[PDB]
């Protein structure tokens, strides 16, 4: 994993910013990635939100 | 030598400090004044006291325009009497300071003073806050310059090194 670091984080001032990005992280699920690339072209019938 | 503020009980920090160089001959002055470029913010003015050149050294930029104006004021006066013809006692001929290495406001402030724009007055001119009230007059004088006047004021702004 390597989203928000640039590293030297875990810090005392960063502590607030650290958790904000952590509670936003999506896990690199192979199938979840493919479903995003495919939904881009495929026609729909239900008004998803 | 550090100069002290006018009052006795105003025990604060000094705005500027004056400096005395060793300089005997004329071909000497030309050296110190040229080497005086590329050096923070410094000022000299026209003539000198004891025949030895001495320049000023300002602490923070902001505390320059408030001294540079306190002098430009007392010189619009010396040229009031010398304009009507009267034996003036005071010595320097031209009190107006000269900005050597300097910032950017003092430029727009140097030119406006050089070409004597004011007329008479004598209504107990406010000594405090005179700085900004003079710098405001600088701008509006430019918003009138009929090409020819504009040409000059835009030059002395761009030059700002000769009296």
């Amino acid at each position: 994993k390597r989203y928000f670091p640039e590293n030297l984080e875990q810090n005392q001032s960063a502590a607030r910013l650290v958790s904000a990005v952590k509670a936003r992280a999506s896990e690199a699920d192979i199938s979840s990635i493919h479903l995003a690339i495919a939904r881009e072209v495929s026609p729909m019938f239900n008004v998803h939100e | 030598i550090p100069i002290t503020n006018s009052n006795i009980f105003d025990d604060s920090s000094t705005p500027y400090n004056v400096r005395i160089w060793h300089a005997p001959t004329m071909t000497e002055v030309n050296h110190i004044l040229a080497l005086m470029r590329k050096s923070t913010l410094v000022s000299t003015h026209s003539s000198w006291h004891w025949n030895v050149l001495h320049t000023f050294h300002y602490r923070s930029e902001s505390d320059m325009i408030d001294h540079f104006a306190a002098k430009i004021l007392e010189d619009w006066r010396q040229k009031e009497k010398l304009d009507k013809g009267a034996l003036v006692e005071a010595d320097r001929v031209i009190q107006r300071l000269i900005p050597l290495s300097s910032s950017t406001y003092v430029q727009r402030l140097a030119a406006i003073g050089a070409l004597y724009p004011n007329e008479f007055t004598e209504n107990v001119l406010d000594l405090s806050r005179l700085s900004t009230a003079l710098l405001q007059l600088s701008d509006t004088y430019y918003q009138h310059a009929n090409d020819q006047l504009r040409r000059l004021y835009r030059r002395m702004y761009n030059d700002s090194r000769t009296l």
Binding site: - | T25, T27, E28, N30, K38, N158
Partner: protein, 291 residues
């Protein structure tokens, strides 16, 4: 042991000042036609030039012999970075200023203690006046003697870029001079004008009389407006080159107004603090003799 017929050593093909450009070699006159200029509105007015001081420095006793000529050029138009030179054997000149001396000044640019075998030298009588004026260049960095590195430059710009319509009034508008170029340009003219035999020129100025001085100044007011141009780009504030479609121009920021540091850096020739005092001492000394 060459002599002058009052035509002067410059009326000779032995040594002639020619710039190389355009794929072939050309005379200074042909070059300057390319220098076209406009105006930017900061009036550069001609001041007066203060007379030099008579006192001549002493040529401290020195065995061997130094190339007096070398340094004269190696400071003015020296291209390769030149370090501090305020110090040096720069005043052996004055050892020629006295009447009966044996020390002779050869061709090529050396100063011999005793004339030696097989070496052609200028005429011992006309090299005397050249010294009583230029040996004075020894004290170029002595405090209380150095010239002023600001006002002379006003004189310089009125020379290479001043249309006569202006000089006759003593005032002119600051100009921005741009000619058309090639590759190295400014640096190439320096590596070129350096080896010119400057001594073959300066000697003529202090000898040739009114008959052959009015005629001398007319054929050489251009060899002067060449070693004055290069000496000027070592001062200008910018060197940025404008672009046409396929063509390239070498706009020079402000000829005739003197700043303190080179625009060239990498693009053109560069001066140093020790050299700023030197150029002012030369430019001042030479103008009185010329003008």
């Amino acid at each position: 042991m060459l002599q002058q017929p009052t035509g002067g050593y410059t009326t000779l093909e032995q040594f002639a000042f020619t710039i190389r450009n355009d794929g072939t070699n050309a005379t200074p006159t042909q070059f300057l036609q390319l220098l076209s200029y406009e105006a930017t509105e900061n009036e550069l007015v001609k001041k007066t030039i203060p007379t030099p001081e008579t006192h001549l420095p002493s040529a401290r006793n020195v065995p061997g012999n130094v190339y007096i000529e070398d340094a004269i050029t190696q400071a003015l138009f020296g291209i390769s970075a030149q370090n501090v030179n305020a110090h040096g054997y720069f005043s052996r000149l004055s050892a020629l200023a006295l009447p009966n001396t044996s020390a002779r000044l050869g061709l090529d640019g050396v100063i011999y203690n005793s004339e030696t075998i097989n070496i052609p030298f200028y005429d011992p009588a006309a090299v005397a006046n050249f010294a009583a004026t230029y040996a004075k260049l020894g004290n170029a960095s002595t405090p209380r003697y150095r010239a002023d590195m600001i006002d002379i430059y006003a004189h310089v710009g009125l020379e290479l870029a001043g249309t006569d319509a202006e000089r006759a009034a003593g005032v002119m508008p600051v100009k921005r001079a741009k000619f058309d170029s090639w590759e190295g340009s400014l640096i190439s003219l320096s590596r070129d004008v350096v080896n010119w035999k400057i001594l073959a020129f300066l000697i003529d100025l202090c000898s040739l009389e009114g008959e052959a001085l009015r005629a001398f100044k007319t054929r050489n007011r251009d060899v002067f407006r060449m070693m004055l141009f290069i000496m000027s780009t070592a001062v200008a504030a910018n060197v940025v080159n404008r672009k046409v479609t396929k063509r390239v121009d070498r706009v020079l920021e402000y000829i005739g107004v003197n700043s303190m540091r080179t625009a060239g850096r990498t693009a053109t020739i560069t001066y140093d603090l020790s050299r700023h005092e030197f150029a002012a001492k030369f430019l001042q000394l030479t103008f009185t003799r010329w003008n």
